[PDB]
Amino acid sequence: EDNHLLIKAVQNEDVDLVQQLLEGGANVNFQEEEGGWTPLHNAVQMSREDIVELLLRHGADPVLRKKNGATPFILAAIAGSVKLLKLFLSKGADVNECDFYGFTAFMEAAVYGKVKALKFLYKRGANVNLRRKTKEDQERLRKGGATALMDAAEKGHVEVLKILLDEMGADVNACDNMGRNALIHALLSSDDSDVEAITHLLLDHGADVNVRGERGKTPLILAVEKKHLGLVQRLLEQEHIEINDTDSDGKTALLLAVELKLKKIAELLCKRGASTDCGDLVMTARRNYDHSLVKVLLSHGAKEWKPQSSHWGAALKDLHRIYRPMIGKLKFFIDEKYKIADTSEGGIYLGFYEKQEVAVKTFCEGSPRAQREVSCLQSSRENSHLVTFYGSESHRGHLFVCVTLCEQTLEACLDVEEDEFARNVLSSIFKAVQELHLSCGYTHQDLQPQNILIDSKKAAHLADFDKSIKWAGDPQEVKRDLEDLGRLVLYVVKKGSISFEDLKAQSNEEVVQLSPDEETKDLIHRLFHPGEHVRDCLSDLLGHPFFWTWESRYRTLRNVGNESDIKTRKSESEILRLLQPGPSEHSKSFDKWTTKINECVMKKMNKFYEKRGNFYQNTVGDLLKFIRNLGENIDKMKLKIGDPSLYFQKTFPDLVIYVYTKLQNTEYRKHFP
Amino acid sequence: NHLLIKAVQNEDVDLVQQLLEGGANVNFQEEEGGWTPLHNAVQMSREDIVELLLRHGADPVLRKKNGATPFILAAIAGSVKLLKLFLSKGADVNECDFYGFTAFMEAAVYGKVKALKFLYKRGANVNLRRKTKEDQERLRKGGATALMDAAEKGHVEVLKILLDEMGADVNACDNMGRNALIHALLSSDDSDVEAITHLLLDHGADVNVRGERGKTPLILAVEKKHLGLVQRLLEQEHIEINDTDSDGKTALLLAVELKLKKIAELLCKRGASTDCGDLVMTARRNYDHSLVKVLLSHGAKEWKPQSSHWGAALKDLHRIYRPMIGKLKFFIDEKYKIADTSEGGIYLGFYEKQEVAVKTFCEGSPRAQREVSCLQSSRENSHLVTFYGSESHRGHLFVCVTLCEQTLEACLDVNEEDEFARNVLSSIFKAVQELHLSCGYTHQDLQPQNILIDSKKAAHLADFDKSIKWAGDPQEVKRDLEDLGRLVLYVVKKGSISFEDLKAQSNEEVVQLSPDEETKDLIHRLFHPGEHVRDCLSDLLGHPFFWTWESRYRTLRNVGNESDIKTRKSESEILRLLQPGPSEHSKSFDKWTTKINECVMKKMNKFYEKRGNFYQNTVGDLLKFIRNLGENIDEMKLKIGDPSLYFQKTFPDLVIYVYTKLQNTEYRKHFPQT
RNA sequence: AAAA
RNA sequence: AAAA
Ligand SMILES: O=c1ccn([C@@H]2O[C@H](COP(=O)(O)O[C@H]3[C@@H](O)CO[C@@H]3CO)[C@@H](OP(=O)(O)O)[C@H]2O)c(=O)[nH]1
Ligand SMILES: Nc1ncnc2c1ncn2[C@@H]1O[C@H](COP(=O)(O)OP(=O)(O)CP(=O)(O)O)[C@@H](O)[C@H]1O
Ligand SMILES: Nc1ncnc2c1ncn2[C@@H]1O[C@H](COP(=O)(O)OP(=O)(O)CP(=O)(O)O)[C@@H](O)[C@H]1O
Ligand SMILES: [Mg+2]
Ligand SMILES: [Mg+2]
Ligand SMILES: [Mg+2]
Ligand SMILES: [Mg+2]
């Protein structure tokens, strides 16, 4: 702790405490974990020579580097202390030493505008024109290679730059590994406070105006993008500036000037003889209602895809063609023609997010809905059953959230035999909600048919998260999603014939009793009454008979009927005691099943046992045996029975669920599909 | 019709005269904006051309698509003569376009002094707030005034005239709650922001009105790094110096973060609270000793990763200071490096508070373009690594995708049925299929180091910096397919054979390297797709290679259960389908009864000594044998052991034989579900 | 806020 | 280019 006290004592420049701690035995060379900072590094950074000397006399290593490889000597240049630079040079520092990114003391003096340090270092033999040597990894990225002059230019240090050029023989035209020279660096200054003076100085010393920065940006183009008439004027006074250069977007200085509505700059470019054959110049000026610029351009000789979506697409084709100003990566138009729906904070609109067609949900940037929607979407990219989040753009207090463009909602789809659609839609939604809860850590709170979106596939996707809640642990929030999911099950099974709102209006038990079949009834009940194992609820329910095809249900009935213990009614057999009813279970459809079957097929099946008289009896096992046996020889009866899967399910609607419930947690699970 | 508009746009009076006198439509509206020849003439401020169009019957008040009238356009152009002309033609001085813009507002927007003065004297309502469409209003658009327009557009003379001569309300607010002062500080034209700000304050503008992120004028001025604006705002009596934006940041904290020493010191001198955040530590990080001392003298104060492999490093990265690059927080450094790369490396990162892998590129590069264009186009492909986003900084491009634990190659470096091989190859097949057919690209670099493994352990396709459009070249698809075939062999061999020499040997050599018939047949089909190239990977997902041993065993039992097989029917479809013939070479099951245990064999024949016939060496009988034995064992286990393994071991060519024979018949119903 |  |  005394070690951490030492560093704090130094940081607060408390000489007495530092003395006290050192004389008490504190580790004078202690390095803090992430950074490798020592008391000495801190003392130099505070520019406190007295504290520095105190530390050295207590045994501080004078050249011990921190994690980025910086020495106390180099830090002394950053602080601008000639006294400290002198001291460390007498303690073994080398004037041209560098950190692990290649920064020397001289460069740092230039970076920080430290004139006296800079002069002192020069006179102690600092190499003025060293280009930074950095790590191999950085070098592949074209990092490294910068010089003190570039540093002075980029940081806007006019006096340092003058001294470098006139007194220290700095190479004005050196380039970094990105190909940038001092002039480019100056025009990349975030501190526009001295850019003009800097630019004048560099140009007068023979700086090359025809050099490129990152995105193909020339000095002239950067000056135009700074909207700086003075910079542009000075650059155009160069005798051999290449006025028609284009950036990485193929844009000239003139085109950019017109696009940025810089009339005076544009006119100057034209008068200097910039080509007007470089884009839609006149149309752009016209679009910006600049009649004066339109005339200037003309008097200087200026001239004059397939959508994925079916439902949208006619509109998307129009949106793809029309002019629209970009908002970051998003091209769209808040207009009735491109509106998908009305919304509390605007609407849903067609858009292109990275040339990709998307739906755009608008928000007031600060709003509770905005942060709920965006927080969930940012955290749920790995969830495949959610609508996929492309990205978001903020503009002027507005937030535009971009998301997979879908054809229609589940509700609209339903407004347009085995119901396979219900099965795989609910399956996708179950998986969506599950991943949301367990992986994403959110609940939805607004599970309803309008928020289920249908692909052109037609695959379903969960959407609308502006009422979602981050999960802290309150089981009531999960329960709400589950009981909306239960109502969603019934909504889909009923094919939208019952609105979702009056399903919400009625109780759980009323929703359950509204179920048209035992599978949906049992599934919904389980959603409404999950165990203590709420976490595994949706996982388990994906294996519920509701999701079994009619062929699969029929197959498992036959599979269980094929158990030899069933085929030969073994008394105390495990499967038979498992399948037995009990007080007080039943008004079951199959309590006297042999009487429910056709007379002809039943007597024909019983014929197989007439020698010993082991006829079928009204036990659940014999019924399963009956189903297994009938299934086998059926490959006359086929007409009298019809679809065998459909037949047994129709006359015994509670059988499948009964078998599942009975064998759900035993080794006989193996018979399930 | 088009020639007339063009004639007007070129101010060619004579040509306009000729076209009009020649019977051109004078009220033609172009498709994009509903522009007429008259709208253009007014925009060009050509009263002579306007008068010409009117005398040929141009509707003087016909609006374009956004609702703007010629009268409103005249204000934009700044033409008093045209404004006067249209008022005499039925224009109302306070009329507006569909977004609420009046002629007066437009004069203010465009800084047209003479137009503005004329309109005011003709009764323009100076203090109207824009009424816009219902949809825009729900977004809190609308509500702006001419004064806000002048302020935002930097029109100083217009602003003074509005304030001093026209009774403009200095403190009106738009629907976002912004006043003129806020609008002034949103000018993209900092040439006049000081004068505008000074003038508004002198007329009693409210300094404490919020902008669009909890931003006060003070905070906005600090963010402009503008000392003059900051000085002037601090001179206002009821300035709220301690207000925080929606990030909870004060003007002082932002000043320190932005390394604005003079501004920060001024704020401190004006009495700003120094309990704002890590003020001092931020100043230290920026090596500003003088700022540290100023702060101190004014009394300043002195989560779980998902990844296992990465995790410790992610915890460190989460904790340390790092400057943000847009939505990305990362550190190009060995400690956080995943791999070396041609244009930098792969690194740990947080893209929107989410852990990701970051691939670095030189921003212009061919590799960068190929990687990013593929990723942007493939977001709906669930089997690819998921694209979070990209950041472009200073000629560098940083591409963020899901962070995976390890590669396929690393994973497999670390009797049994190879469950892993089927599951990884299934995912990769679906990945490639979607890339080709949905995303419309070819990968071109299918190899084990580009298959990434989840914590699940699910497989994902990555690395797209060599991907191609795709434009129609079958050869491009072919290359992916034969890389895929080699990937199959590579995985089945558990990585014991390097992928590079797999690539070095021919297709026939790779096929012949297969250790079992299922991989052999699957690889051959990848190397030799038919006319159905597009459905190749989709069809092959149903190949026996992807059937579990249980499922292979089951289909055999299913086929063996056919009645025609049990009752060796004279002319049955299934028996003739299963029948070999010329010149099918010697299968392992040709004399199968001799290959059985064969104490098991006599026990099996025991079922047919009273009724029926003993097993013969036909394929049908072997399938019946398999079906029967399955039934018996379910009711022998010690002799056979695992039955699926048993039949596959002694008859390795049986499963593929049955599949090939029955593939395009109704008997495919006996196959597994997927 | 808004044109081939 | 780079500290708790
Ligand atoms: O190793 C074995 C061999 C056979 N069996 C069963 O013994 C019965 C004989 O059938 P098979 O002789 O093979 O054939 C029948 C018809 O299938 C068509 O021709 C014949 C009739 O004329 C069938 O049982 P069950 O019919 O379900 O009672 C078979 O499963 C075993 O259990 N284990
Ligand atoms: N990605 C998309 N593709 C197609 N249609 C979409 C869509 N996203 C939303 N929609 C449509 O717009 C409707 C509304 O979108 P959304 O559900 O996200 O807003 P919302 O319900 O939260 C607004 P409010 O609460 O005020 O009613 C959806 O029900 C759907 O009809
Ligand atoms: N999302 C991710 N998660 C974990 N590791 C990843 C990863 N993305 C890439 N890697 C690792 O980094 C290695 C290289 O990444 P990547 O394949 O994308 O670059 P690359 O092969 O195109 C560069 P080069 O051509 O120079 O060899 C990968 O093989 C893998 O080991
Ligand atoms: Mg909704
Ligand atoms: Mg909602
Ligand atoms: Mg790779
Ligand atoms: Mg690559």
Side-chain angles (χ1 to χ4, degrees), chain A residues 1-9 21 25-28 30-31 39:
Chain A
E1 292 173 338
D2 294 25
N3 296 358
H4 256 85
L5 291 181
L6 180 56
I7 280 176
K8 300 174 198 301
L21 293 171
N27 181 7
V28 72
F30 177 81
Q31 303 191 261

Side-chain angles (χ1 to χ4, degrees), chain B residues 310 338-343 346 356-357 359 367 371 385 401-407 445 447 449-450 452 462-466:
Chain B
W310 325 109
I338 296 166
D340 284 318
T341 239
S342 288
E343 291 173 18
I346 315 294
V356 296
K359 186 167 190 171
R367 284 170 174 264
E371 185 91 48
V385 66
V401 298
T402 116
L403 178 61
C404 293
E405 291 301 273
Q406 57 178 353
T407 64
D445 196 26
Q447 70 156 9
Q449 274 140 330
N450 289 338
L452 309 185
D463 186 10
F464 307 95
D465 70 347
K466 290 186 176 180

Side-chain angles (χ1 to χ4, degrees), chain B residues 357-373:
Chain B
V358 186
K359 186 167 190 171
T360 75
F361 291 101
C362 302
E363 186 186 21
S365 75
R367 284 170 174 264
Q369 296 181 43
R370 288 190 295 263
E371 185 91 48
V372 99
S373 64

Side-chain angles (χ1 to χ4, degrees), chain B residues 30 64 106 130:
Chain B
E30 56 78 45
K64 50 186 178 72
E106 294 289 12
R130 290 203 269 288

Side-chain angles (χ1 to χ4, degrees), chain B residues 105-213:
Chain B
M105 296 166 184
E106 294 289 12
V109 168
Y110 286 90
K112 300 299 184 184
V113 173
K114 293 178 184 177
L116 189 90
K117 290 190 178 190
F118 173 77
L119 291 171
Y120 174 73
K121 289 182 174 183
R122 288 298 176 98
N125 189 334
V126 175
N127 292 309
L128 279 177
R129 301 171 70 262
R130 290 203 269 288
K131 178 59 178 178
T132 185
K133 304 170 185 181
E134 289 189 19
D135 306 328
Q136 267 89 347
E137 224 144 67
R138 275 184 256 113
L139 225 206
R140 296 189 197 289
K141 283 171 164 294
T145 64
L147 184 69
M148 301 174 193
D149 293 327
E152 179 168 330
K153 294 307 170 96
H155 303 310
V156 177
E157 296 302 318
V158 166
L159 192 104
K160 292 190 290 192
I161 289 159
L162 287 171
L163 289 170
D164 295 339
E165 300 179 29
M166 299 184 174
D169 184 357
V170 73
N171 279 320
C173 295
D174 62 17
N175 294 333
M176 184 65 48
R178 298 172 296 219
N179 61 13
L181 173 58
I182 291 298
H183 278 274
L185 301 174
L186 308 188
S187 179
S188 69
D189 188 83
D190 287 73
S191 57
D192 290 310
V193 64
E194 261 199 275
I196 297 292
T197 299
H198 187 183
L199 290 162
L200 290 171
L201 297 178
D202 190 78
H203 288 77
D206 195 334
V207 285
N208 295 315
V209 169
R210 303 297 181 122
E212 54 230 10
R213 252 186 303 196

Side-chain angles (χ1 to χ4, degrees), chain A residues 121-139:
Chain A
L121 290 169
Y122 178 73
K123 286 177 173 189
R124 286 294 180 108
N127 187 327
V128 178
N129 293 308
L130 291 177
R131 297 169 73 261
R132 291 204 268 287
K133 184 57 174 178
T134 190
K135 299 139 164 198
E136 307 182 14
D137 311 335
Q138 260 90 347
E139 223 127 271

